[PDB]
C-alpha cells in the first residue's frame, strides 16, 4: 500500500512505490510521521515537499499516503480551538504532550475524538428520506451561543438508511448512513474538505447589509457590507487591534475566525492571550468570545506550508460556518506575511520571480481567496442564507502601496480602512484616515438605508464634503491665517473640527463609546449637520445685510448648542433607553432650531 | 533508549566536489547524519550528510575537502543527526562553533542531549513579554527598553562599534534589582582580533559566571557558522525552559550568518533567490529568532538581541529587512554619532522597542519611566529640529524655547547617549540622568509627562 | 449579446482560451453572418497574469517583468482578429479593457498592447478623484484611425482641426499648470492664465459628461469651439484660416 523514501535534499523528499499517489496529495514521511505535500510525480516515484525539518529522515523509511489532498476536519469542537495553518490543535498539542513545543511529527486528530456532545437529529427526517449536500440532518449543542448545525458533505447524496436517535455522540460514532447507486456511505458529525477548493453554494448573492462594527467612523463613512472584502494597513504605530477587537467583541457577525498568517512570535501570543479575556453581551448575559470563534494562529517560525495554508484553512472553516447559515467574519492579521510564505514556497519549488520577488500567481491566489467571501444561499434544503466577511490586513513597506501584495489587495478589496500613525500619535482613535480610506459598498447599502435610515445618505455625503472642505481651507489658513477666511468657511472649519473630534473619534475604553449603535451614530451626525445647515443658513441669509451672522455670534448667543453637540457622545445604550437617546437628540434639534431663530 | 547498534565506516568515496564528498553503496543513510571523515594521513574531519538518494550520501565535510581521495579516505557514520551535549555547566565557558570547548576546560558532561534544530515553541504556550531586562546602556534602557522575551536587533554597519556594544550588553545585562540570569552570547564570522576581544573582555571584566560564549571565527569552516546560532539557542532553550533561568541571547553578526546560508545553499545547487540569498531565508531566520519568549508554567525566559551589520548601510537589504519583519523592534547604531566620538553611538530617533510599554512602568522599574522615555524622545527630536534651524537662522534668531531644546540636545548627546565601555548605569541611574536633563525645561514645557508625574519627580 | 465569464476563482489557464472563444464567436457572427460585432475583452491584465503564470511554469524565456518572450505575439493573436474583410459586411470592433499595474503606462501589458492597437484611451485618477466622469484623459490618448474616420462625409469639416487644437490647448494648459505649481500665477502671462483657464473649462465641460448622457459629435465639436473661442482667432495655431473663417465666429 504505502511507499518508501528514496532521497532527501533539504525539505524535499523523493519517494518510490508512489504509483497510486496524486499531485498535492497529503503524505506522512519517516518513522516520526512528518507532514508533506506531493509536488511532482515522475512515474512510480514522487517528490514530497516536507513541512517540518527533515533532519533524520532515512532512505527506506515508510511514506504513508493520506487518502486526501491538504484538508480541514470540520465538525463539533472547532469553537474555542486554536489551530495552526495545517489544522493541528495547538491547545491539545499543549495539554496532551505536557510540552511547551510542537513535537516534530504530531499525529493528534484535529477535532478531538471521545469528547461526546449533545446531538439532536433533525426530527423531520425518516429512514428512506431523500437527502443532499448541505442538508441539516441534525444539530450539536456544543455551546450556548452557537448551535452547531451538522450537514451532509457537499459531494454526498442519497437516501437515508439509518440516523442516530437523540443522545450524546462523538466523531467515532456513525451518526448517519445513506445509500446511492446501491452503495452505502457511512458518515459522522466530522466532515472533511480540501482546503484549496471553494465550498460550493446554491447562489452567491449581491451583498446589501452593513457589517455594523459599533465604530462611528467605520459604520458611517466607510461601511463594510456583511460578506464584504476589506483591508487594513496593519502596522504597529497605527493600532490595528482597535478594529479587530471591536469587530469581534460587538459587531453584527454570528461567528468570528481569526487567522495568524505568520505573525511575530510575541505579537501572536498577545492575541492568543488577550482574545479569551474579551466578552460580549448576549441575551443580557456576559460571555467570553471563545464561544463564537476559532483561532488559526501561525508564528513566523511555523513551517512555510503552514503559513501559506493559514488563510486557506481560515476561509475553509469560515465557509463551513457560512453553510450553517451564519454571518461569519474572518480576520487575516498580515496577508503580507502570507505572501512571504508564497515567495518562499515558490523559491523552494524553483519557480521564476514575478513582481519584486513574489510568484506569478500572487494576484490570482489573492483574488481567488477574496472571492470566497460574500452572502450566499446555502446548499441543501432548509434554504438559509449565510456569509463570510474577509478583513485582510496588509503591511506595505514604509506605507508604499506599490508593494505587490498591498497593490493586488487594494485592487481586489472593496473597502480600505486606512489607519494612520499620524492620527495615532495625536491619539485620534480609531485613527482611520478618512481622506485615504474608501468603501465601494455605498451603492449596495442604498436599499438598506432607504428603508431604515432614509436621511442618512444625504448626511454621509455632507459629512465627507464638510471634512474635505476643511482640508482644502487649511491650506488657506496656512497661507493667510484663520482670520482671512469667509464666514461660511470659518463655520465649515469649526463644524468639520466638531465632526472630526466628537463624531469620527471614539474612546472605546469608556462606557459610552465601548460600542456605539447605528441609530446613535445617525442621530449624532444628523444633529451636527442640521446645525451646519442652519448655521450656514443664518450666515448666507445675512449676506449683504447691515448686521451679518458669523460663527463667533453663534458661539456667543448659542454656544450651548455647540457644547451639547460635543456632549451627544456621552449617551449610554445601557443606562438610557433607545427612545430616551432619540428624544434627547430630538430635543437638541428643537433647542438648536429655536436658538437659530433668535438670530435668523 | 539510545543507539545500541555499532557505527559503520565506508571507503566508498565515489567523488569529491568542492566542499562535498559523495559516499556510495551506503546503507539506509539519514539526511543530516553526522560523519567522521578520515583522510589518507589519518587526520579526522567532521562532516554532515547534505543529501541522500538511494545508495548515495552527499556529505558536506566541515573543513575543506583538501586531502580527500577516492581510495584511502574512509568515512564513519554515527547513525544520528547532530545532538548537542548540553548542561548548566556551559555557563562560565567558551566554545568553538562546533560546541567543542576552547577555554582549556574539559568536554561537557551532558545533563541531556538535545536536537540542535530544536522544535517550534507551541503558540498556545508562548506567554507575552512583560518585565524589563536592564542592559545598562542608557540609549537602550531609557529609550528602547527591552521586555524579557522580546526580540530586538541592533542594526549596525561595517566599521561601527556594534561589537563593543554587544560586549557591553553582555557584561552589564541583568535583572532590574527592585542571581538566576545568564547570557548566551554567540558570535559568527568573527575575525580573530574580535574573538580575542570578546573572550578577553568577558574573562577580565567580571562576567563569566553568568555567560556562555560561542565563537565561530571568520576562517572557521562555513557550516560551523550555520550551526553556531542553533547551538547557542539550543543551550538557551535548556537554560530557560528546563532550568528556569532568565536568558539574554546575543547574536553578534546575523549578516555573517546570512553569508553562510549563501554558501550552504550553493552547496546544494539551489538557484539563488532575492539579492542572491536563499528564498527560504525568511523561514530560516524565523527558526533562529523565534526560539525566544516566556512560556506557560516556566519562570524561564529567552530574550534575543540579534546584532546585524546592514550591508552598504541599507535598511532595504534582505538581512535587516527580514529581521525587521520577524522581530519586535530595532536599535540603530549610527555612523553620524560614531564619527562624533559619541559612544555608544545608538541613534534614539529611528530606534524603537515595540514592547517598551509592557517592559516598563510601576513595580517593574519606576512609575515615571514610561512617561520620561516619551518626553526624552520628543525633546531630542525637537532639539535636532532646532539644531537644523540654528544652522539656517543664526543663534540670535532662536527663541528662548529653541535655546532650551538646543541646550537639552547638547547635554543629551554628551551625557545620556555617551556612556563609555565600562560604565554600568542601572535603569535608576538612567532615569535620574533623564531628569537631570528634562529639569532644564520649565515644568510646563514637558507636555508629554502627566502633571502628577512632574509633581512627583521634577522636584530635586 | 453573448457573455463569456471567467471569474477570479475559476481556473487561471482557462483565461488563455476565454478571449479566444469570444473572438471565434465574433468571427462567426461577423465574417460568416455579416453582424457588425463589437468585442469587449475585460481585464486583459487578468489574462496576462495567466500568461505570466504559464510562462513561469514552463520555464519560458522571460521578457520585461517576467512575461513570456512570445507575449507580443500572444496579444497579437487576440488583438488582430478585428476589422473588415472584402465582400463581408461584418466588422469586428475590439475594445479591450485593462487595469495597468501600479498605474504604470510603460508596464508590459499596456505597452505591448500599445504597439498592437489602433491607439488607446486612457482613464485617470487625476480626473476620477475630482469626480470628472468619464475620467478619460484626452492627452495621452490617440486613435490611429481617426485620421480617416473624420471630415466631410463622416463628420463636419472642422473636426480634424478642432481635435488638434484641443490637444494643443489642453497640453499647454497642463504645462502652465505645472509652471504655476512652482512659481505662482504672478509668473504667468495673461495668455498662460488663459491656457490654465482652458484646461479647467475643458475638463468641466468637454470631458465631464453624464453616465447616461449621449452627445453627438456635432454637439461635442460645438462645445470644442465655444471653448476654443476663449482665445483670439489668430492664437489657434493648429487650425487653417479657411476653417477659422467658417467655424470660429459662431
Amino acid at each position: 500500500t504505502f511507499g518508501y523514501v528514496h532521497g532527501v535534499s533539504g525539505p524535499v523528499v523523493t519517494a518510490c512505490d508512489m504509483a497510486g499517489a496524486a499531485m498535492y496529495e497529503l503524505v506522512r514521511v519517516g518513522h516520526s510521521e512528518l507532514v508533506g505535500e506531493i509536488i511532482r510525480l515522475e512515474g512510480d516515484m514522487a517528490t514530497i515537499q516536507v513541512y517540518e525539518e527533515t533532519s533524520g529522515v532515512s532512505v527506506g523509511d515508510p511514506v504513508l499516503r493520506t487518502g486526501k489532498p491538504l484538508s480541514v476536519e470540520l465538525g463539533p469542537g472547532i469553537m474555542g480551538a486554536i489551530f495552526d495553518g495545517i489544522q493541528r490543535p495547538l491547545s491539545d498539542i499543549s495539554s496532551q504532550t505536557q510540552s511547551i513545543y510542537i513535537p516534530r511529527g504530531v499525529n493528534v486528530s484535529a477535532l478531538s475524538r471521545d469528547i461526546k456532545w449533545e446531538f439532536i437529529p433533525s426530527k423531520n427526517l425518516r429512514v428512506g428520506s431523500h437527502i443532499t449536500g448541505g442538508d441539516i440532518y441534525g444539530i450539536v449543542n456544543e455551546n450556548s451561543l452557537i448551535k452547531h448545525k451538522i450537514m451532509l458533505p457537499p459531494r454526498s447524496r442519497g437516501s437515508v438508511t439509518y440516523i442516530a436517535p437523540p443522545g450524546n455522540y462523538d466523531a467515532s460514532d456513525v451518526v448517519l448512513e445513506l445509500e446511492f447507486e446501491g452503495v452505502k456511505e457511512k458518515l459522522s458529525m466530522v466532515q472533511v474538505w480540501p482546503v484549496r477548493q471553494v465550498r460550493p453554494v446554491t447562489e452567491k448573492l449581491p451583498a446589501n447589509h452593513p457589517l455594523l462594527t459599533g465604530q462611528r467612523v467605520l459604520d458611517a463613512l466607510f461601511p463594510c457590507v456583511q460578506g464584504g472584502t476589506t483591508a487594513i494597513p496593519g502596522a504597529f504605530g497605527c493600532g490595528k487591534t482597535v478594529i479587530s477587537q471591536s469587530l469581534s467583541k460587538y459587531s453584527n457577525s454570528d461567528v468570528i475566525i481569526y487567522v495568524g498568517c505568520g505573525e511575530r512570535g510575541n505579537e501572536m501570543s498577545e492575541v492568543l492571550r488577550d482574545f479569551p479575556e474579551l466578552t460580549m453581551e448576549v441575551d443580557g448575559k456576559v460571555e467570553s468570545i471563545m464561544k463564537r470563534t476559532a483561532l488559526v494562529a501561525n508564528t513566523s517560525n511555523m513551517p512555510v506550508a503552514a503559513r501559506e495554508a493559514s488563510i486557506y484553512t481560515g476561509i475553509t472553516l469560515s465557509e463551513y460556518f457560512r453553510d450553517m447559515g451564519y454571518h461569519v467574519s474572518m480576520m487575516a492579521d498580515s496577508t503580507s506575511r502570507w505572501a512571504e510564505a508564497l515567495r518562499e514556497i515558490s523559491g523552494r519549488l524553483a519557480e521564476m520571480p514575478a513582481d519584486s520577488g513574489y510568484p506569478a500567481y500572487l494576484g490570482a491566489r489573492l483574488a481567488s481567496f477574496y472571492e470566497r467571501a460574500g452572502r450566499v444561499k446555502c446548499l441543501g434544503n432548509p434554504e438559509r442564507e449565510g456569509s463570510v466577511s474577509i478583513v485582510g490586513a496588509v503591511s506595505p513597506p514604509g506605507g508604499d502601496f506599490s508593494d505587490p501584495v498591498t497593490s493586488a489587495t487594494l485592487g481586489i478589496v472593496q473597502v480600505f480602512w486606512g489607519l494612520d500613525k499620524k492620527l495615532a500619535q495625536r491619539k485620534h482613535f480609531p485613527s482611520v484616515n478618512w481622506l485615504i480610506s474608501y468603501s465601494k459598498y455605498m451603492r449596495a447599502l442604498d436599499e438598506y438605508y432607504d428603508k431604515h435610515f432614509t436621511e442618512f445618505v444625504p448626511l454621509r455625503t455632507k459629512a465627507k464634503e464638510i471634512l474635505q472642505e476643511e482640508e482644502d481651507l487649511a491650506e488657506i489658513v496656512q497661507l493667510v491665517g484663520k482670520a482671512s477666511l469667509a464666514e461660511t468657511d470659518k463655520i465649515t472649519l469649526e463644524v468639520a473640527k466638531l465632526i472630526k473630534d466628537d463624531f469620527l473619534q471614539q474612546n472605546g475604553y469608556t462606557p459610552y463609546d465601548r460600542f456605539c449603535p447605528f441609530y446613535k451614530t445617525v442621530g449624532m451626525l444628523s444633529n451636527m449637520i442640521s446645525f451646519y445647515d442652519m448655521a450656514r443658513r443664518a450666515v448666507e441669509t445675512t449676506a449683504q445685510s447691515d448686521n451679518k451672522i458669523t460663527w463667533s455670534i453663534i458661539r456667543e448667543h448659542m454656544g450651548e448648542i455647540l457644547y451639547k453637540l460635543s456632549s451627544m457622545k456621552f449617551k449610554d445604550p445601557v443606562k438610557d433607553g433607545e427612545a430616551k437617546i432619540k428624544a434627547d437628540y430630538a430635543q437638541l434639534l428643537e433647542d438648536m432650531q429655536n436658538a437659530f431663530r433668535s438670530l435668523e | 533508549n539510545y543507539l545500541s547498534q555499532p557505527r559503520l565506516t565506508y571507503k566508498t568515496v565515489s567523488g569529491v566536489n568542492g566542499p562535498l564528498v559523495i559516499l556510495d553503496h551506503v546503507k539506509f543513510p539519514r539526511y543530516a547524519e553526522i560523519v567522521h571523515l578520515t583522510l589518507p594521513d589519518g587526520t579526522k574531519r567532521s562532516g554532515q550528510v547534505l543529501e541522500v538518494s538511494g545508495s548515495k550520501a552527499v556529505v558536506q565535510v566541515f573543513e575543506g575537502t583538501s586531502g580527500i581521495d577516492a581510495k584511502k579516505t574512509s568515512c564513519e557514520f554515527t547513525g544520528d543527526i547532530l545532538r548537542t551535549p548540553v548542561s548548566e555547566d556551559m555557563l562560565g565557558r567558551v566554545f568553538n562553533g562546533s560546541g567543542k570547548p576552547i577555554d582549556r576546560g574539559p568536554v561537557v558532561l551532558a545533563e541531556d542531549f538535545l536536537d540542535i534544530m530544536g522544535q517550534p515553541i507551541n503558540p498556545q504556550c508562548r506567554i507575552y513579554p512583560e518585565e524589563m531586562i536592564q542592559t545598562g546602556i542608557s540609549a537602550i534602557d531609557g529609550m528602547n527598553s527591552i521586555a524579557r522575551g522580546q526580540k530586538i536587533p541592533i542594526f549596525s554597519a561595517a566599521g561601527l562599534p556594534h561589537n563593543e556594544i554587544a560586549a557591553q550588553i553582555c557584561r552589564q545585562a541583568g535583572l532590574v534589582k527592585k542571581e538566576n540570569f545568564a547570557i548566551v552570547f554567540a558570535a559568527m564570522g568573527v575575525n580573530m582580533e574580535t574573538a580575542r576581544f570578546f573572550k578577553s573582555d568577558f574573562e577580565e571584566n567580571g562576567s563569566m559566571d553568568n555567560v556562555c560564549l560561542f565563537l565561530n571565527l571568520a576562517n572557521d569552516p562555513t557550516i560551523e557558522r550555520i550551526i553556531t546560532p542553533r547551538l547557542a539557542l539550543t543551550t538557551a532553550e535548556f537554560l530557560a525552559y528546563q532550568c528556569e533561568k532568565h536568558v539574554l541571547v546575543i547574536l553578534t553578526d546575523m549578516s555573517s550568518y546570512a553569508e553562510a546560508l549563501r554558501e550552504v545553499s550553493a552547496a546544494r545547487e539551489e538557484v539563488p533567490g532575492r539579492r542572491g540569498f536563499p528564498g527560504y531565508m525568511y523561514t530560516d531566520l524565523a527558526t533562529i529568532y523565534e526560539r525566544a519568549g516566556r512560556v506557560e508554567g516556566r519562570n524561564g525566559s529567552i530574550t534575543q538581541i540579534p546584532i546585524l551589520t546592514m550591508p552598504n548601510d541599507d535598511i532595504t537589504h534582505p538581512i535587516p529587512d527580514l529581521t525587521g519583519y520577524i522581530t519586535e523592534g530595532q536599535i540603530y547604531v549610527d555612523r553620524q554619532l560614531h564619527n562624533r566620538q559619541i559612544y555608544p553611538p545608538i541613534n534614539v530617533l529611528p530606534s524603537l522597542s515595540r514592547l517598551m510599554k509592557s517592559a516598563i512602568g510601576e513595580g517593574m522599574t519606576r512609575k515615571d519611566h514610561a512617561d520620561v522615555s516619551n518626553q526624552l524622545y520628543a525633546c531630542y527630536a525637537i532639539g535636532k529640529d532646532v539644531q537644523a534651524m540654528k544652522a539656517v537662522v543664526g543663534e540670535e534668531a532662536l527663541t528662548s524655547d529653541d535655546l532650551l531644546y538646543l541646550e537639552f540636545l547638547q547635554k543629551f548627546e554628551k551625557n545620556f547617549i555617551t556612556q563609555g565601555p565600562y560604565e554600568n548605569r542601572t535603569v535608576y541611574e538612567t532615569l535620574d540622568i533623564g531628569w537631570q536633563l528634562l529639569r532644564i525645561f520649565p515644568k510646563e514645557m514637558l507636555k508629554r509627562i502627566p502633571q502628577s508625574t512632574l509633581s512627583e519627580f521634577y522636584p530635586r | 449579446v453573448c457573455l463569456f465569464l471567467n471569474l477570479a476563482n475559476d481556473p487561471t489557464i482557462e483565461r488563455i482560451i476565454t478571449p479566444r472563444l469570444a473572438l471565434t464567436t465574433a468571427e462567426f457572427l461577423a465574417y460568416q453572418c455579416e453582424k457588425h460585432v463589437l468585442v469587449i475583452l475585460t481585464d486583459m491584465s487578468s489574462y496576462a497574469e495567466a500568461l505570466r503564470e504559464v510562462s513561469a511554469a514552463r520555464e519560458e524565456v522571460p521578457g520585461r517583468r517576467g512575461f513570456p518572450g512570445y507575449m507580443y505575439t500572444d496579444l497579437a493573436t487576440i488583438y488582430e482578429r478585428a476589422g473588415r474583410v472584402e465582400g463581408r459586411n461584418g466588422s469586428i470592433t475590439q475594445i479591450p479593457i485593462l487595469t495597468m499595474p501600479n498605474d504604470d503606462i510603460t508596464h508590459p501589458i499596456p505597452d505591448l498592447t500599445g504597439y498592437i492597437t489602433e491607439g488607446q484611451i486612457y482613464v485617470d485618477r487625476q480626473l476620477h478623484n475630482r469626480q470628472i466622469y468619464p475620467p478619460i484623459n484626452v492627452l495621452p490618448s490617440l486613435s490611429r484611425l481617426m485620421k480617416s474616420a473624420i471630415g466631410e462625409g463622416m463628420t463636419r469639416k472642422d473636426h480634424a482641426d478642432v481635435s488638434n487644437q484641443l490637444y494643443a490647448c489642453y497640453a499647454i494648459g497642463k504645462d502652465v499648470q505645472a509652471m504655476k505649481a512652482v512659481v505662482g500665477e504672478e509668473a504667468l502671462t495673461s495668455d498662460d492664465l488663459l491656457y490654465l483657464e482652458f484646461l479647467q473649462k475643458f475638463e468641466k465641460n468637454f470631458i465631464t459628461q453624464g453616465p447616461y448622457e449621449n452627445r453627438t459629435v456635432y454637439e461635442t465639436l460645438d462645445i470644442g469651439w465655444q471653448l476654443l473661442r476663449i482665445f483670439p482667432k489668430e492664437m489657434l495655431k493648429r487650425i487653417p484660416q479657411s476653417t477659422l473663417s467658417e467655424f470660429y465666429p459662431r
Binding site: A350, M352, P353 | E269, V271, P272, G273 | E59, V61, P62
Partner: peptide, 23 residues
Amino acid sequence: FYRLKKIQEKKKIIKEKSEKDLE
C-alpha cells in the same frame, strides 16, 4: 535567476545521461 535555472536543468540532464552511459 533564469540563466542559473537553465544551467541547473542542463546539469540535471547531463547527470542523467552520464548515468545512462554506465550500461
